[PDB]
Amino acid sequence: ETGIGQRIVCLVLDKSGSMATGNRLNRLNQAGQLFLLQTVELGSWVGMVTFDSAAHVQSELIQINSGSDRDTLAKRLPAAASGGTSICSGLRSAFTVIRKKYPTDGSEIVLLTDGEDNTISGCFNEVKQSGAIIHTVALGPSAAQELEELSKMTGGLQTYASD
């Protein structure tokens, strides 16, 4: 969080090729819309990051004050799915997006992925040293175990929005 009690949240969104299967991308967008348009509260600082082989910053941290702010972020939800998969590119970039303004300790990630990635241990340390809180939504049924181990090691929640 920010020193005065404002939330810091960075959406981290799996646009990789496996996400074109079934309705994963639709379920990604639906939860991204819900979190953006209804859930996250006034005053919060919110960034957005998509990722395939690598990360693409859809937005730096902007503060939620108007419905404009919500619609802007929501319009940047991934359109289609393509490319390689590297969850760590996104978390690394999330931590960079945050640390342009605030420390990662106490901040929150919202990792929307199907979990089909087996290099996740690659960033365990940095994920630990960040102090961030990685909530995860599993959008497929074949999520790697290190996806769960990301929330477990950071204090974040896990929910499963597949079928």
Site residues (vs Ca ion, CB under 5 A): 1, 5, 16, 18, 85, 116
CB of 118 to Ca ion, least distance (A): 10
The least CB distance from residue 71 to Ca ion, in Å, is 27
- Cβ-based nearer residue to Ca ion, 89 or 130: 89
Q: How far is the CB of 129 from Ca ion (least distance, A)?
A: 21
Return the number of the residue (2 or 72) whose C-beta is nearest Ca ion.
2
Q: Are 107 and 10 in contact (CB under 8 A)?
A: yes
Closest to Ca ion by CB, 16 or 107: 16
What is the smallest separation between the CB atom of 54 and Ca ion, expressed in angstroms? 13
At closest approach, how far in Å is the CB of 16 from Ca ion?
4
Per DSSP, the residues of the chain read --TTS--EEEEEEE-SGGGGSTTHHHHHHHHHHHIIIIISPTT-EEEEEEESSSEEEEEEEEE--SHHHHHHHHHTS--S--S---HHHHHHHHHHHHHTTS-STT-EEEEEE----S-GGGGHHHHHHH--EEEEEE-SS---HHHHHHHHHHT--EEE---
